[PDB]
């Protein structure tokens, strides 16, 4: 059961890493959108 | 006739910001590719 | 943020290497010699031993970057000797949120709560809302056509 | 061998999906750059 538990932990960790990467990408895109909006406001 | 001078000054002051922002995003695709490169290595390790 | 991403990537690489391993299937002499040989010092040599900072700002008017050099041994702008340097943050997210709250870019036509929040967060912005010293639009370069 | 073949197919399809997502992101960034260049040309 140790190998199965290790595999389950690895799957959980990789799912968490994928979710964190997706959240980071969403935050980066939101920051880019906010910067573009600020640039548009500065040149309005 | 001051509107032309005002818009010329605004364009002159904004060209630097515009092309600086344009040049800052030139390396952005390369940064994204090099940040996603470890993901490919992890996928290869998982496949192995 | 870039440092956090880099350290996360290095931790991921370290754990991958550990998993692969588990389961498979110092210039003192140089300075002395330079002093003995050259026998001359310039201000552009003491800062060479430490990493420098370059802050270029180019423009389309002329093809020449505006290189900026900052001291590394002092806690000035751009120097990295004790920790995180000056980032000039916490002054854009609030403005962006206020602008996007009502989908209006101009803060003059915003709600009273947004104006109060902008005044409280930015003390220097309270002198524009009161409409003091009236002036047509915002044209810093008015001296030319005024004269 | 069926489970191993299914796992290999899943790995291949997830790699293909990751490559497609990367290509889509590259296309989106290229489109954004082209739009910014067109905007700069319109205000040149």
UniProtKB/Swiss-Prot annotation, chains A, D:
It comes from the Viruses. It is found in: Virion tegument; Host cytoplasm; Host nucleus. Interacts with host CUL1 and CUL4A; these interactions inhibit the E3 ligase activity of cullins. Interacts with inner tegument protein. Interacts with capsid vertex specific component CVC2. Interacts with the major capsid protein/MCP. Belongs to the herpesviridae large tegument protein family. Large tegument protein that plays multiple roles in the viral cycle. During viral entry, remains associated with the capsid while most of the tegument is detached and participates in the capsid transport toward the host nucleus. Plays a role in the routing of the capsid at the nuclear pore complex and subsequent uncoating. Within the host nucleus, acts as a deneddylase and promotes the degradation of nuclear CRLs (cullin-RING ubiquitin ligases) and thereby stabilizes nuclear CRL substrates, while cytoplasmic CRLs remain unaffected. This is Large tegument protein deneddylase.
